[PDB]
Amino acid sequence: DYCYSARIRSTVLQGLPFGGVPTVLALDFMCFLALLFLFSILRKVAWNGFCSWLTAIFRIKDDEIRDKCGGDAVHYLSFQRHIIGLLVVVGVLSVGIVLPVNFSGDLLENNAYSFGRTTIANLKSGNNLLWLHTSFAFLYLLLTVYSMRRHTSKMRVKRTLFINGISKYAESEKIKKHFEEAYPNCTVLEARPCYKPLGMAFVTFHNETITAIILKDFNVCKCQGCTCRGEPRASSCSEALHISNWTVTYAPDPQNIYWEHLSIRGFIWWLRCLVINVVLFILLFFLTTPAIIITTMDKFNVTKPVEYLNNPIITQFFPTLLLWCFSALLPTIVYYSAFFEAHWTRSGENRTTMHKCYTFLIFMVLLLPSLGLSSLDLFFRWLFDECVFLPDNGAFFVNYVIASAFIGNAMDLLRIPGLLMYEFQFGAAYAWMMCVFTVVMTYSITCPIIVPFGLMYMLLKHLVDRYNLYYAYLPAKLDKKIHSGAVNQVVAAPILCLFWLLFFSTMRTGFLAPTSMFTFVVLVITIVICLCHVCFGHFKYLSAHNYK
Ligand SMILES: CC(C)CCC[C@@H](C)[C@H]1CC[C@H]2[C@@H]3CC=C4C[C@@H](OC(=O)CCC(=O)O)CC[C@]4(C)[C@H]3CC[C@]12C
Ligand SMILES: CC(C)CCC[C@@H](C)[C@H]1CC[C@H]2[C@@H]3CC=C4C[C@@H](OC(=O)CCC(=O)O)CC[C@]4(C)[C@H]3CC[C@]12C
Ligand SMILES: CC(C)CCC[C@@H](C)[C@H]1CC[C@H]2[C@@H]3CC=C4C[C@@H](OC(=O)CCC(=O)O)CC[C@]4(C)[C@H]3CC[C@]12C
């Protein structure tokens, strides 16, 4: 009883020794080591001793970080410090309690060196123990929440609106009298157009709930047979106003405002947005696909015996190193290109780009490679001329995590030196570390052995951060709304762990098989709760964001 019966048909599909992890690891370490020597001769070029910086890493006290950098660096390092701790608990459960279950699988017991043995693919469908995987996936959601209730637990104008689309010939009298007659419950303190004003204004009220009500009445989605939104109500003042044509917003400070960009609104602005974002999403397909093609040479006609796999130098190391190169350049595209979308507020742009870096990195590292590698008609050709799971059984992901761990972090030292010719980007750095955490979490239950490398991705990213925050990057104060943003991404990670579990369950047993059902039930219950935080606002004691 086996899956491949390698004695009958010596089929190329049965993968490398150890998934090619040993060669990837050996070359990645050796490339890391070489980069640390290269770093040393770089930082010594400009003016205590060769490796002195490596001693500094473990000497600097947390209070020195706190004192020099300010609170944003400590809130950042707290986030890391929690995720490191999170991954020890998830790590010990994965390697301790998931892996010995997987490895008890009867399905890949031939092919003893196959990395596939340490994955869900080793478990025969209908085997009772498959509930343990669904259970841990849920348990990990509770831990990624509880660990973020702890992170957030440790950490620390409101009547003024900015009103846009006023005609340049408008008058403060009419603008003032409008609110106090269209909404007689209000009272107006100030009402001023702003920098021949170009049709933007500040207005200030007496009361905050009234402010929110007035702010809603220009923007709110509620409907009739006539119109899909609450159209802003008429007045005697209206000729100065052009009320229907406004956009109205809580006023940020003028240091946040792009007085250039907000000159365009409605369908035109959504055109510039969609044709920038489509070009980038098209481009991801071509950046992605070389990695998947170079990896997938399990074709036939000739070159069919197991002996015909290439060296894991080309079939594992090279493609994951190329995918890393594109992963590490991707932030530099979206930070550059987001300038041309013309957001209204620098704060928005910063807060947008962190979620855009993250979701493009997710499409091009996790989701499109997951669909690409899952698109193995390969099994259909073997079968016609369950044991379906990724080619190499997902060793590709381990190999990515290793590549990003050793080569990525060693490169992170070198990201700030220079002189080879003869300021902390908090959003980018958040996006990048949650991209990697997402992969680890996604595979942590289908493919346990990824988690140790996930942990050491974090430890080395942490040390290199604690180092380069204190010594290298300029001390920076930041907009708090990105730290709170990043915690939502951490909650996405175990949810995508549940989704791919439902996928690789439902492509290996029916949707009516009870583990498929249970995973669906958990997922649908989880998502309605998570959505009810976003605007509906019912749950605000739960899931995250305990604050001082
Ligand atoms: C296969 C392809 C062609 C379609 C797959 C869908 C994605 C391209 C979509 C689905 C959800 C979208 C995201 C949903 C929400 C946001 C948040 C948005 O930023 C916000 O914070 C909005 C609210 C605010 O700024 O206050 C920026 C765009 C982004 C990342 C979107 C980018 C495009 C995404 C990933
Ligand atoms: C193959 C299956 C999984 C379908 C593909 C689904 C994706 C399009 C989803 C999965 C997870 C989603 C992300 C999970 C979490 C967030 C956080 C969310 O954050 C906020 O809106 C923060 C707002 C604030 O903090 O003020 C922005 C969208 C984003 C990136 C989502 C974008 C759409 C993603 C990539
Ligand atoms: C039929 C329906 C139920 C299918 C749902 C498919 C997608 C639309 C789902 C799958 C995963 C979801 C995400 C999973 C996790 C999160 C984190 C969490 O993010 C926030 O709270 C950000 C917004 C805020 O700051 O208030 C809640 C929304 C979000 C992005 C979800 C948005 C909707 C997503 C993309």
From Swiss-Prot:
Which locations, inside or outside the cell, does it occupy? Cell membrane; Endoplasmic reticulum membrane; Lysosome membrane; Early endosome membrane
Glycosylated position list: 301
Membrane topology summary: Multi-pass membrane protein
Q: Name one GO cellular component term.
A: endoplasmic reticulum membrane
Quote the annotated effect of residue 412 to A: Decreased localization to the plasma membrane
Q: Cytoplasmic compartment: which residues? A: 342-345, 473-479
Tissue specificity field: Expressed in cochlear hair cells (at protein level). Highly expressed in the subfornical organ of the brain. Expressed in small intestine.
Q: What happens when the gene is disrupted?
A: Most mice die at birth due to impaired alveolar expansion and respiratory failure. Viable knockout mice generated in a mixed background of C57BL/6N and FVB/N show severe necroptosis of outer hair cells (OHCs) in the inner ear and progressive hearing loss. OHCs also fail to exhibit regulatory volume decrease and calcium influx under hypotonic stress. Conditional deletion in excitatory neurons of the subfornical organ leads to impaired hyperosmolarity-induced drinking behavior.
Q: Specify where it is mainly localized.
A: membrane
How would you describe the post-translational modification of this protein?
Palmitoylation is required for localization to the plasma membrane and stability.
Chain spans, region Gating helix: 395-422
Question: Catalyses which reaction?
Answer: Ca(2+)(in) = Ca(2+)(out); Mg(2+)(in) = Mg(2+)(out); K(+)(in) = K(+)(out); Na(+)(in) = Na(+)(out)
Q: Which residues lie on this side of the membrane: Extracellular?
A: 104-127, 297-311, 445-447, 509-513
> Which one of the record's GO molecular function terms can you name?
osmolarity-sensing monoatomic cation channel activity
Main role? Answer: Mechanosensitive cation channel with low conductance and high activation threshold. Osmosensitive cation channel preferentially activated by hypotonic stress. Also acts as a phospholipid scramblase in response to changes in membrane structure: upon changes in membrane curvature and thickness, alters its conformation and translocates phospholipids, such as phosphatidylcholine and sphingomyelin, thereby controlling plasma membrane lipid distribution. Forms a heterodimer with SLC19A2, which mediates phospholipid scramblase activity following Ca(2+) stimulation.
UniProt record similarity statement: Belongs to the CSC1 (TC 1.A.17) family.
Annotated protein name in UniProt = Mechanosensitive cation channel TMEM63B
